[PDB]
Structure formats: C-alpha cells, structure tokens
Design a protein around this ligand. Structure first.
Ligand SMILES: OCCOCCOCCOCCOCCOCCOCCS
Ligand SMILES: OCCOCCOCCOCCOCCOCCOCCS
Ligand SMILES: *[C@@H]1O[C@H](CO)[C@@H](O)[C@H](O)[C@H]1NC(C)=O
Ligand SMILES: *[C@@H]1O[C@H](CO)[C@@H](O)[C@H](O)[C@H]1NC(C)=O
Ligand SMILES: *[C@@H]1O[C@H](CO)[C@@H](O)[C@H](O)[C@H]1NC(C)=O
Ligand SMILES: *[C@@H]1O[C@H](CO)[C@@H](O)[C@H](O)[C@H]1NC(C)=O
Lengths: 532, 532
C-alpha cells in the first residue's frame, strides 16, 4: 500500500488526506526519539528504539509542554499560535506529507517552527504541509523539539542538563530524515531545512554547528538568524537563570545535582508558571531558556565563527517582514493596545526604547532615541509608534539578519534575500501592526489557495509564486526557473547587495536593505556600549 | 561746519563723501584709546588722552597687526578680507558715517568686524558704512580692536597680559560712542551693536559680560555666537598657548614676567610668524589667541551664565548662512581646491571629520561620520563634500548659535532669526562653496546698490530689504514696519521657534532650524565625549 512504509525504525501506516480537490499521503506523529521524560528531562535526546508491528501515523502527535498565550481568549490572531493538541513531555515526533503517487527520489523540505524557543508546535494549521507538498511535489517534513526549560535549561559542566538539547532534538529529527526519507520517496541528498523566527535562528545554528552541517543540503531563514540578540546566551547567564528558576521553586541550590533533581520532580506547569521570572532585565523580545554558546554545539562565539568562515557553505534563501516588532510592543510596551491606533506619547516612546534595548546604558538609550526620532515633529504619535516598531524590528530581526547575510555571503555559494511587505486582506490584527512577525508563513504554506480562507486572487497568485520560489530553491539552489520568462530574483552579492520585495505588485529590485539603521545597530551602538 | 564736531576728547574734522549720487559726512580714524605699544602691548586699553586743536578724521586709520592671507595672491575673493591699510600696533580707532544734514538724535549702529579673533579691519570695502548710513539714515560706527596675541594672549594671574584685552578695546570704543555719539547727532540710548563671525561672537560676549551690558541697547549677531567652540578657551589652555608661543621664540619661560618681557621685545611679525604653531590639535576652524573664561569679563562659564539668565535682556536679531563651513575646508581639508568641484573620496571625508572635530575620540568621530553619511551611497563624492561642509558649519556656527538663541529667548524681550541662503550672482568663489561664510555682509552694507559692482536688480532689492530690517530693528527692536503691507518676519518664540529665509524669493517661514543635527551637536555628542 501507498500508505505503508517500512523504515529502519519499523513500519509506519499513514493516511490519505484531501487537498485542493485532490489527495496525498500523510504520515503524522512518527517518533524519532525516546520520550524525554522522568530522569530524561533536560537530557540530550536518545534515538527511538526500533519497534515491531505497524506504527499508526494517521493522527497528529502531542505538542511539547509550553507557555500558552491567553492575552486574547478566543481571538484567532493569537490562538492560531497556541498548541492545538494536548501538551506532553512525550512530544518528539515528526510529520511527513508525500505526493501521490509516491515519488521515487524528490526534493525534501524540513520545517522548523519558531516561538522564541519557549513555545511552538508542528501541528498548527498554518504549518499544514499538504498544500506545499501537493503543489510543488516535494516531500514536506515538519519536526518538533523541546522548548522552554525542557529544551534549553543550561547548567554547563553537567551532563544531566548541558543545554541546547532542544537543538539536538532538531538534529536527531534531521538525522532520521537523512536515514529514512528515501523510503518515503524523498532524496536525502537534497534536503532543505527552513524555519521562521526561532526556527530561522535554528536553521542558521545548524549551518554553524559542525555536528549538524552534514545533515542537510540548503537552508531557508525567515525572520531570524543565529546571531539574534534573543537567540542565545553565555554559559554563565544560562547557569544564572537555571539557578534562579530553582530559586523560584524553592529548590536546593547547593549543587547542580540538587538543583537538577529538584527541577525533575516538578510538574511541567510548575516550571512554566515561573519561567519568565528569571529574565535579567525589564524587556521585550527576550526569552528565558535559549541556546547557549557552550563550546560544543557551537565551538566558539558566533561572531568569530562567522568571521573565519567556520560554517557550512551552500546556498541560502532568507528575508524579513516589514513590521517584525509590532507583536512584541503590543504585548509588552506601555501605550500599545490591540483595539486602538496606539499613538505613542513621548513618555511611552522612551519607556519603549528602554524595554527594547534592555542591555544599554543611558548613553546607548539616547543614541537609539536620537537615531529614531524626527526632531521636527517629536510629539507625533504616529511617528513615535512606528519609530518604536522599527527599533524593535531592526534590533531583533532585520539588522542581525543583515549582519549574518553579509558575513555568510563572503564564503557562501549563493544568497537570495527578500523583504516581505504585503499585509494580508483578511488580517484580524489592527492596521498599526502592519506586516506582522510570522505572517509570511501562511503564504509559504499556501493557505491563500483555499477559497474558504478568504484571501484575494492576487494573494493566491503571490502565495503560488513564493511557494514555487521556495521549492525551486530547495530543488536547485536557485529560486528562479531555468530559462523562464518571469522576472528574475537577483543573487545577493557582497558588492551589490541586491534583494527583492515580496508582494502583489510587480517585482522590484533594491539594494542595501535598511543599511542606514543597521550600520547603527551592527557597528556604532556595540562600539558605544563597549567603550562605556 | 557740518564736518566739525567737538567731542569730550577734543575737536574732530571729517570729510564729505559721495554716495549713490548724494553725499554724507565721514569721520574716519578717530582715536578712542592710547596706542597699545611698547610696554602697553598685551595690556588692557587705556582711554585716549584728550587733545587740543582739531583732529583730522578724513582718512582711514591703520589696521591692527595680523596674519595676512596669501593663499590666492591677487584673487579678490580672499584679498577683500586682508588689511587694506598699513598695519600697526597703533590701531585703536573708530569710524563714523553721519547722514547729511546732521541728525539731532537718530539710531546708532556699531559694527564689530570678524576674522576669527586673529584678523580683521574696520576699513574693508565691504564694511563701508556710507550706503547704510545714507539709505536708512542711521549714524553708523565701525570700531577696531587688537587681534591675535596682541589682543588675546592670556596669562591669567598677571596684570601685564590678563587676556581679553581685545574685547576691552571693543568696550572702550562702545564707551566712547556712549559718551560722544550725541555730538554727531546719534542717540546714545539707542545703540545697536552688530558683527559677523568673531564679531558676532563678540556681540554675544558683550551681552553676557556685566561690564559691557549697559553700553548698548540691542544686538545683531551674524554667523557667530559667544558659545562657539572656537570663540574661547580656559585660562589653563590660554596659559599653555602663551608659553608655547614664547617657546617658539626662544623666550625665557621661568616666569610670566620673563615670558611677557620677551614677547614685548619681539617685532609684531615675529609673533605672527609662529602664531599657528601653538594650536593643541590638527584642526580647522580653530584659532590660537581668543577670549578666555577668566572669571572677570565672564564671571562664570558661558553655559551656566546662559542657564541662569545672567545676561543683558533686550531684543536680538541673528542668523546664519547656508554653507558656513566651505571656506575652512577649502583652506585646510585634504581634497578641497579652489578650482575643482572638490568631490571628496571616502578617505578624505574621514580625514576631514577628524580635522573638524579635533577634540573628539574615535567613538565621537564615528558618531559624527554615522550622522552625516548616506550609507545607501557612501562613495558619492558630491555627498561626501557637502556632508563635510555641513559638519563644519553645524558644529562651528549654526548649532552653537541655535543653542544660544534657545537659551536667550527664555529670558529675552524679543528674538528674530534668519537663514541666509542666496548665492550672489557675481560670486568669484567656486559653486561648491555655496552661500559662503561672510557673504551676507555685502548685502547688509548695501554693496548691491552700486551698479558698478554688477549685482542683479533682485539682489539690490534684497539688499534694501535686509538693510531696512536691520535698521528698523535697531531703531525699534522689531525688523518689521509698523502697520506695513510687507510680509512679516515672525518673532522667534521658545515654543514655535520660527525663522525666515533671506533671499530673492518670496519670504517663507520655517521652524526649528537644523534641529535634527543640532540635537546631535548640542545634546548627544557632548554627552558621549564626556562619558568617555
Ligand atoms: O506568566 C507570567 C509572565 O508573563 C509575562 C511575560 O509573558 C509575555 C510573553 O510575551 C511574548 C511575546 O508575545 C508575542 C506573541 O507571539 C506569538 C506569535 O509569534 C509568531 C511567530 S512563531
Ligand atoms: O603661517 C603658517 C601657519 O599657517 C597655517 C594655518 O593658517 C591657515 C589659516 O586659515 C584660516 C582659515 O582661512 C579662512 C579665510 O577666511 C577669510 C574670510 O572670512 C570671512 C569672515 S570675516
Ligand atoms: C490507527 O488505526 C485506527 C483504526 O482504524 C484509527 O482510529 C486511526 O487510523 C489510528 N488511531 C486513531 C486513534 O485514530
Ligand atoms: C558555487 O560553486 C560552484 C562550484 O563550486 C561554482 O562554479 C559557482 O560559481 C558557485 N556559485 C556561486 C554563486 O558562488
Ligand atoms: C588733514 O588735512 C589735510 C589738508 O587738507 C588733508 O590732506 C586731509 O584732509 C588730512 N590729511 C591727510 C594726510 O589727508
Ligand atoms: C518686552 O518687554 C515689555 C515690557 O517689559 C513687554 O510688555 C513685552 O511683552 C515684551 N515683549 C516680549 C517679546 O517679551
């Protein structure tokens, strides 16, 4: 049967699923690791012990234990990101969508979800891989990984809670794809890993980590890069936060053994209830448990790795959205609300900048304020709101990504950069938030192709173009069709730094994406903060 | 006779001079101080001993000893500023232009020449006061004062070379006008002092200095303010430079007595030949001997005086030109030349910034560079040239003046701000220099009214408007005519900060003159330099 596949781990039984008036195969909830429960919590993943019989892969698996956003109960805008399956520590599974009839050896795309390393699920509706698998005829895989303390509590030195285990979960899933995707008709030598936000940072981290490089061919990064200020911490900070977590749960802090043992007896929700209390500053776009520069997964600092060319060299396709920062200001900066235009006063603006650049002293805060203020109209509420929006987006996503792309392009074999600036017609979030963090995903996964979702004809056309760019890049390392008549997405070169916009209007080529502000965030500010 | 005037110092005989097909009286070379020669060099001025007989005031007096610009021999552009009379230490004289018939008690305007405190003459053609005296019917006076070491060598503590004597020369001339202008038909209670560049800084210094305040009614400042970075030094720096001067002339440096005695035996030209060797940095727009914050002429720092409102409160009219910096880049920054478009490379740009902000560390230099560079086109020669031009102008003239006007307006009784941006049609300097430092003067003194000079009809109209603004302000404290139909020059208020352009086009009102860049130079940079 087309729904029965024999893998090196055992036999699996999928299910036929409808898609755009047709059908394809789906293998949901395939385990790739042993459940990381009990004494296994915080530990490196362990390969799934082979099973006899047939594994039923007809239903989605549980989502990993995580913080659940309840800011807007019932609002689809925020709940579309919450886990849609019961949560459990037994959550290391992957999902595969296979074209029908089953291909013999086609392009593979593995999706890595985002969520600030503190949340995320592979089962979200916006991540349904059938549309992309069916439309572009690629084998689409979505993996999962532990988030929060469960996946990133770091007590460097101990082997019971080494840190980065969530990244190792991802790697093991990639190892499984490498070893078994051939049986599903996928070609293991043509695997493209792609992800958004923390998922994009993750993709970049696998590009850097020597132990991950060999497991994939090409990479796509959406609104995220490994060097983002929120994507990693030092082993000292990681240790400080883990101890602080134990302190919040009345744990014995005499030794890592005592601390770890205590954290292991706690129920998942107990750790999650105090997760945000360990942050060192009053901030936004900062998460408690994230990857640590351990000297193992990451041999040295990310910066020195980027400078020496210590990373996988291949082709990459990456980009950002126009208003990456709005989500984080809505949720944590004073003055921003979901149902108002959120015109920001001067006082709230400054409160926002301190929150956005929590690691800066007063001189640094002034530098930022000066850089983003129109002194010819400093009391303009719209201008203060948008300026703060740009500050958060430039500092946390865009500039870190531009630094990465410029460093990578020096050693890489091909780079394609995009700027997503189309605001969906059916967007439920307020207008002031613009092209929101995470809203290019629905186009990448082809949601606009399903009429019931209410997108326009141009948006469906845009989704098809993007899906074809992504899939074509995955297949050849170039988003453009061989000898096509369509407009060409120019290669991003170290000299010309070209990129394109991604919207319903005719393609436009630009250069030096937000170079003015990124010279500030990547060159000046760090130099200023260090000199003081 | 109309050309004979009996003053408290003695009788004076003037001369009738033609002007625009008419005539007026001129009293040139009237002494107001004892010659500051021999043992008097460096000393505070002494009032001129009254004379018997009639002083012949029919010819211009000698110019004070000063550095003479020889960069462009024969070029009218630069030679129009060099002394046009023999130089001599015996140079403390003033000139008076009186309407004919002699007025009974009319408005008086006293001109204070600029020249970086190291040069200047009251006898320059561009300072001829007959056009203004005749056209607006005001008594126009032009004073003189010692420049260079002769007027500003400062050895705080000694009474032989206290410093600021050049400023005291100006005051004594103002004292003479106060006491004698009535005999020339001038009203001593309606005296307006005006000056350009160092002359403008001087006007602002008399506004601050308690000992000068009572000697005038109103003030006009052109391209200069007391707080300019080049307009003053501390007593320690003043002392260091004086000793360094002595060191350049093989003087005994054991004591102020030894040093001063040695400097007094030197010929004027010997001091001038090494004058520029005492500067502490490799710079531009920095002069060796300038006013010192002595705690006498200036009771405390200029900043604290401005903050506490420690200054004369009256009306003021001041402004700047569009390209104040070009002159100084032409003369001292690599890459700029008189006969080329001076497109500046990236290397020369950076050389220029270091030269323009000589007191800044590397972080400060980066801050400036970042602030004035278009990173979307950083190799644009035109953009680098103009950016450097703006850096020099903003740092040395505009921003310091904006800081002054905003501080003054808080306590003042009326402020009128202008932005002169008209490039004369007969300008001999290259196009890239734009509206040059010092070129609004010819319009203030009405040179465009004389056809032989080759200005256009609109330029003559512009000159007449400006002269009438200046004279009307001098007479009433408001540049606008009572119940006139002409466009109104709005008052500059602390809240709206309005100002007007000064050119041949219809009047336009603007707000917050170069506020974006001045927040950088007046608030951020100083804070950055101090924190490091
Ligand atoms: O529980 C007590 C502590 O709570 C305080 C802090 O919690 C606030 C967390 O806010 C995080 C930011 O929220 C943004 C929501 O992002 C969801 C959409 O992201 C799309 C990309 S996967
Ligand atoms: O003599 C040896 C030392 O010389 C080196 C330094 O001398 C250079 C002096 O340059 C000063 C700047 O020149 C600008 C000329 O300005 C004249 C016009 O000013 C108009 C306003 S009054
Ligand atoms: C495994 O097979 C059962 C039996 O048909 C079916 O319900 C489904 O495909 C899998 N299990 C569940 C609970 O759905
Ligand atoms: C990629 O690598 C191939 C072979 O190594 C080379 O021929 C090609 O020019 C490279 N392309 C880019 C964009 O570097
Ligand atoms: C003083 O009077 C003389 C005599 O007429 C005349 O030359 C001039 O007015 C004054 N002196 C000089 C040298 O010009
Ligand atoms: C100037 O002072 C007078 C009287 O002191 C006052 O009436 C007038 O309002 C003042 N004008 C300004 C602009 O301050």
């Amino acid at each position: 049967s087309e729904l029965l596949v024999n893998t090196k781990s055992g036999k699996v039984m999928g299910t036929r699923v409808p898609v755009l008036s047709s059908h394809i195969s789906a293998f949901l909830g395939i385990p790739f690791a042993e459940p990381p429960v009990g004494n296994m919590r915080f530990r490196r993943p362990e390969p799934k012990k082979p099973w006899s019989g047939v594994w039923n892969a007809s239903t989605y698996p549980n989502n990993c234990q995580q913080y659940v956003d309840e800011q807007f109960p019932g609002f689809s805008g925020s709940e579309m990101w919450n886990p849609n399956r019961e949560m459990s520590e037994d959550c290391l599974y992957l999902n595969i969508w296979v074209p029908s009839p089953r291909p013999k050896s086609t392009t593979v795309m593995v999706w890595i979800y985002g969520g600030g390393f503190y949340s995320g699920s592979s089962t979200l509706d916006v991540y349904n891989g059938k549309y992309l698998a069916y439309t572009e005829e690629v084998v689409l895989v979505s993996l999962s990984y532990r988030v929060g303390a469960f996946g990133f509590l770091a007590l460097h030195g101990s082997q019971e809670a080494p840190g980065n285990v969530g990244l190792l979960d991802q790697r093991m899933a990639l190892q499984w794809v490498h070893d078994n995707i051939q049986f599903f008709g996928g070609d293991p030598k043509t695997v493209t890993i792609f992800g958004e936000s923390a998922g994009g940072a993750s993709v970049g981290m696998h590009i850097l980590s020597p132990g991950s490089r060999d497991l994939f061919r090409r990479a796509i990064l959406q609104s995220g890069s490994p060097n983002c200020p929120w994507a990693s911490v030092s082993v000292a900070e990681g240790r400080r936060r883990a101890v602080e977590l134990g302190r919040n749960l009345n744990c014995n802090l005499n030794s890592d053994e005592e601390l770890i043992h205590c954290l292991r007896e706690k129920k998942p929700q107990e750790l999650i209830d105090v997760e945000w209390n360990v942050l060192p500053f009053d901030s936004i776009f900062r998460f408690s448990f994230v990857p640590v520069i351990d000297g193992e997964f990451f041999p040295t600092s990310l910066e020195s790795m980027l400078n020496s060319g210590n990373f996988k060299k291949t082709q990459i396709l990456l980009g950002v959205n126009k208003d990456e920062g709005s989500f984080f200001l809505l949720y944590g900066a004073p003055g921003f609300s979901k149902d108002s235009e959120s015109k920001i006063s001067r006082e709230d603006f400054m409160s926002g900048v301190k929150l956005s650049v929590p690691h800066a002293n007063d001189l640094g805060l002034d530098a930022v304020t000066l850089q983003y203020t129109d002194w010819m109209d400093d009391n303009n509420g719209i201008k203060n709101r948008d300026g703060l929006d740009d500050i958060v987006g430039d500092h946390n996503v865009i500039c870190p990504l531009m630094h990465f792309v410029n460093k990578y392009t020096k050693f890489g074999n091909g780079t394609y950069l995009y700027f997503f600036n189309h605001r969906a017609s059916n967007l439920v979030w307020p207008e002031w938030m613009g092209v929101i963090h995470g809203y290019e995903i629905e186009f990448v996964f082809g949601l606009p192709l399903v009429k019931e979702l209410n997108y326009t004809a141009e948006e469906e056309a845009l989704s098809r173009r993007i899906m074809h760019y992504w899939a074509t890049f995955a297949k050849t390392g170039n988003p453009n069709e061989p000898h096509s008549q369509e407009s060409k997405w120019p290669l991003f070169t170290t000299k010309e730094q070209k990129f394109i916009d991604l919207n319903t209007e005719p393609m436009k080529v630009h250069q030096r994406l937000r170079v003015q502000m990124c010279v500030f965030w990547n060159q000046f500010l760090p130099k200023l903060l260090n000199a003081t």
